[PDB]
Design an enzyme around this catalytic site. Structure first.
Site, PDB file in Angstrom:
ATOM      1  N   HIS A  78       1.757   6.125   1.502  1.00  0.00           N
ATOM      2  CA  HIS A  78       2.079   5.653   0.129  1.00  0.00           C
ATOM      3  C   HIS A  78       2.804   6.765  -0.593  1.00  0.00           C
ATOM      4  O   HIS A  78       3.743   6.491  -1.326  1.00  0.00           O
ATOM      5  CB  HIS A  78       0.849   5.183  -0.619  1.00  0.00           C
ATOM      6  N   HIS A 235       4.027  -4.738   0.085  1.00  0.00           N
ATOM      7  CA  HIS A 235       3.236  -3.552   0.496  1.00  0.00           C
ATOM      8  C   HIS A 235       3.616  -3.062   1.908  1.00  0.00           C
ATOM      9  O   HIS A 235       3.664  -1.829   2.117  1.00  0.00           O
ATOM     10  CB  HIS A 235       1.725  -3.819   0.398  1.00  0.00           C
ATOM     11  N   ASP A 239       4.933   0.626   3.120  1.00  0.00           N
ATOM     12  CA  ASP A 239       4.307   1.477   4.161  1.00  0.00           C
ATOM     13  C   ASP A 239       5.389   1.884   5.165  1.00  0.00           C
ATOM     14  O   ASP A 239       5.518   3.091   5.448  1.00  0.00           O
ATOM     15  CB  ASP A 239       3.146   0.763   4.848  1.00  0.00           C
ATOM     16  N   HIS A 262       1.698   0.914  11.718  1.00  0.00           N
ATOM     17  CA  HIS A 262       2.023   2.368  11.791  1.00  0.00           C
ATOM     18  C   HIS A 262       2.354   2.753  13.233  1.00  0.00           C
ATOM     19  O   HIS A 262       3.307   3.551  13.455  1.00  0.00           O
ATOM     20  CB  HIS A 262       0.854   3.231  11.297  1.00  0.00           C
TER      21      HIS A 262
HETATM   22  O1  7TF Z   1      -1.869  -0.804   3.508  1.00  0.00           O
HETATM   23  C1  7TF Z   1      -1.910  -0.626   4.715  1.00  0.00           C
HETATM   24  N1  7TF Z   1      -1.901  -1.622   5.609  1.00  0.00           N
HETATM   25  C2  7TF Z   1      -1.778  -3.029   5.227  1.00  0.00           C
HETATM   26  C3  7TF Z   1      -2.994  -3.503   4.460  1.00  0.00           C
HETATM   27  C4  7TF Z   1      -3.998  -3.905   5.525  1.00  0.00           C
HETATM   28  C5  7TF Z   1      -4.890  -2.724   5.851  1.00  0.00           C
HETATM   29  O2  7TF Z   1      -4.669  -2.000   6.811  1.00  0.00           O
HETATM   30  N2  7TF Z   1      -5.912  -2.531   5.011  1.00  0.00           N
HETATM   31  C6  7TF Z   1      -6.871  -1.445   5.131  1.00  0.00           C
HETATM   32  C7  7TF Z   1      -7.938  -1.569   4.054  1.00  0.00           C
HETATM   33  C8  7TF Z   1      -9.266  -1.793   4.414  1.00  0.00           C
HETATM   34  C9  7TF Z   1     -10.265  -1.913   3.444  1.00  0.00           C
HETATM   35  C10 7TF Z   1      -9.955  -1.810   2.091  1.00  0.00           C
HETATM   36  C11 7TF Z   1     -10.911  -1.921   1.218  1.00  0.00           C
HETATM   37  C12 7TF Z   1     -11.855  -2.071   0.500  1.00  0.00           C
HETATM   38  C13 7TF Z   1     -12.939  -2.335  -0.160  1.00  0.00           C
HETATM   39  C14 7TF Z   1     -12.910  -3.155  -1.283  1.00  0.00           C
HETATM   40  C15 7TF Z   1     -14.086  -3.460  -1.967  1.00  0.00           C
HETATM   41  C16 7TF Z   1     -15.297  -2.950  -1.519  1.00  0.00           C
HETATM   42  C17 7TF Z   1     -16.589  -3.275  -2.224  1.00  0.00           C
HETATM   43  N3  7TF Z   1     -16.453  -3.183  -3.678  1.00  0.00           N
HETATM   44  C18 7TF Z   1     -16.692  -1.772  -4.038  1.00  0.00           C
HETATM   45  C19 7TF Z   1     -16.966  -1.607  -5.526  1.00  0.00           C
HETATM   46  O3  7TF Z   1     -18.057  -2.450  -5.891  1.00  0.00           O
HETATM   47  C20 7TF Z   1     -17.729  -3.822  -5.704  1.00  0.00           C
HETATM   48  C21 7TF Z   1     -17.469  -4.096  -4.229  1.00  0.00           C
HETATM   49  C22 7TF Z   1     -15.331  -2.146  -0.394  1.00  0.00           C
HETATM   50  C23 7TF Z   1     -14.160  -1.842   0.285  1.00  0.00           C
HETATM   51  C24 7TF Z   1      -8.623  -1.587   1.730  1.00  0.00           C
HETATM   52  C25 7TF Z   1      -7.622  -1.471   2.702  1.00  0.00           C
HETATM   53  N4  7TF Z   1      -3.133  -4.385   6.609  1.00  0.00           N
HETATM   54  C26 7TF Z   1      -3.591  -5.173   7.585  1.00  0.00           C
HETATM   55  O4  7TF Z   1      -2.870  -5.656   8.437  1.00  0.00           O
HETATM   56  C27 7TF Z   1      -5.056  -5.462   7.647  1.00  0.00           C
HETATM   57  C28 7TF Z   1      -5.459  -6.773   8.304  1.00  0.00           C
HETATM   58  C29 7TF Z   1      -5.617  -5.462   9.066  1.00  0.00           C
HETATM   59  C30 7TF Z   1      -1.754  -3.914   6.463  1.00  0.00           C
HETATM   60  C31 7TF Z   1      -1.928   0.782   5.238  1.00  0.00           C
HETATM   61  C32 7TF Z   1      -3.237   1.091   5.938  1.00  0.00           C
HETATM   62  C33 7TF Z   1      -4.144   1.639   4.858  1.00  0.00           C
HETATM   63  F1  7TF Z   1      -4.887   0.607   4.352  1.00  0.00           F
HETATM   64  C34 7TF Z   1      -3.212   2.190   3.791  1.00  0.00           C
HETATM   65  N5  7TF Z   1      -1.847   1.720   4.103  1.00  0.00           N
HETATM   66 ZN    ZN Z   2      -0.388   0.798   2.673  1.00  0.00          ZN
END
Ligand code: 7TF
Ligand code: ZN
Length: 297
Positions: A78, A235, A239, A262
């Site tokens: 990011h 998004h 990335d 990635h």
């Molecule tokens: O954005 C990216 N990749 C995109 C997004 C996605 C991915 O990898 N996502 C990765 C990802 C996984 C989990 C979270 C979260 C959260 C979370 C939210 C709330 C609570 C509870 N809450 C807490 C607070 O209290 C209330 C409850 C707890 C945890 C965010 C991002 N992706 C996919 O393909 C996904 C499907 C596999 C492609 C990359 C990788 C990293 F994320 C950063 N950049």
């Molecule tokens: Zn990302």
């Protein structure tokens, strides 16, 4: 000519690491000509410095990660996205922990801070990689492609089989579309199911609605919903662009990602660097004739 940009001023931000749940203090310092982007673990004695070149990439599973020895920097995409966006050549990026802070899930907070500070041109031609040939990688149904293009442009499809998945294809020419306005605010996203598993593997420890799009079976759970119709794929572009900054020189060409991550983006990088036939380095002695262009410092 087109000249290298660094930061005018230093920037301090504070946030958490998405995977680590760690409070992390971030400092962006100007860097000399031909430094490129250089990440730095100030919490370690001595200090450990990992240039953000592709050569330094590690576990690509959950995020883009830089490694030297058994010291890592997690989730650089990011920030590198943001730096790439504004055309920063040279910066040092100081951190009190292993993970780059997530802020809101987008590049926007990073772009803000960078531009509040402002940019410094430097008596040195910016060096560019011009894509000269199709370069493609596939693995199963994923694909990731450079195509020569007189400018810089990124395209992405995704398919999630999901009630929420609104649009799943986008294309942006950054020589006529504001990275800042159209891409930078696009948040990362997790699925409700994934999250339950990952928390019980000590991943996504800093994840919240305050820095992620949370998706149920059915609906975005974020009260204030999406920044864009097509935030998710917007998004993915964000990335992609970050990953491409690991070349350590800006890109005159086009990227096309299909369902790519990635891992495959980084393969595409390696293959491209390997095929010297496919590219060349260029500087431009006259910006009024060059195919991509820049915002005021
Ligand atoms: O954005 C990216 N990749 C995109 C997004 C996605 C991915 O990898 N996502 C990765 C990802 C996984 C989990 C979270 C979260 C959260 C979370 C939210 C709330 C609570 C509870 N809450 C807490 C607070 O209290 C209330 C409850 C707890 C945890 C965010 C991002 N992706 C996919 O393909 C996904 C499907 C596999 C492609 C990359 C990788 C990293 F994320 C950063 N950049
Ligand atoms: Zn990302």
């Amino acid at each position: 000519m087109i000249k290298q940009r660094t930061l005018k001023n230093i920037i301090r931000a504070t946030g958490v690491g998405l995977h680590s749940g760690e409070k992390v203090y971030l400092t962006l310092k100007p860097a000399p000509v031909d430094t490129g982007i250089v990440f730095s673990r100030t919490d370690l004695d001595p200090v450990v410095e990992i240039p953000a070149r592709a050569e330094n990439v590690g576990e690509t599973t959950m995020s883009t990660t830089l490694v030297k020895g058994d010291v890592k920097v997690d989730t650089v995409e990011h920030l590198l996205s943001a730096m790439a966006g504004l055309g920063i050549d040279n910066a040092y990026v100081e951190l009190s922990a292993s993970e780059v802070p997530i802020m809101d899930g987008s590049a926007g907070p990073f772009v803000f801070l960078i531009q509040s500070a402002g940019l410094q041109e430097q008596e040195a031609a910016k060096k560019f990689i011009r894509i000269k040939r199709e370069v493609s990688v596939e693995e199963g149904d994923k694909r990731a492609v450079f195509v020569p293009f007189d400018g810089f442009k990124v395209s992405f499809e995704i398919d999630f089989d999901h009630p929420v998945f609104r649009t799943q294809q986008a294309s942006v020419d950054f020589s006529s579309t504001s990275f800042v306005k159209e891409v930078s605010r696009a948040r990362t996203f997790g699925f409700m199911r994934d999250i339950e598993y990952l928390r019980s593997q000590n991943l996504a420890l800093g994840g919240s609605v305050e820095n992620a799009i949370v998706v149920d079976e059915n609906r975005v759970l974020n009260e204030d919903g999406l920044r864009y119709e097509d935030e998710f794929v917007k998004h993915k572009i964000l990335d992609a662009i970050g990953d491409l900054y690991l070349l350590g020189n800006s890109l005159i060409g086009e990227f096309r990602g299909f369902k790519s991550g990635h891992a495959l983006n980084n393969q595409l990088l390696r293959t491209l660097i390997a095929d010297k036939d496919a590219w060349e380095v260029v500087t431009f002695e006259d910006a009024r004739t060059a195919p991509i262009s820049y915002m005021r410092p």
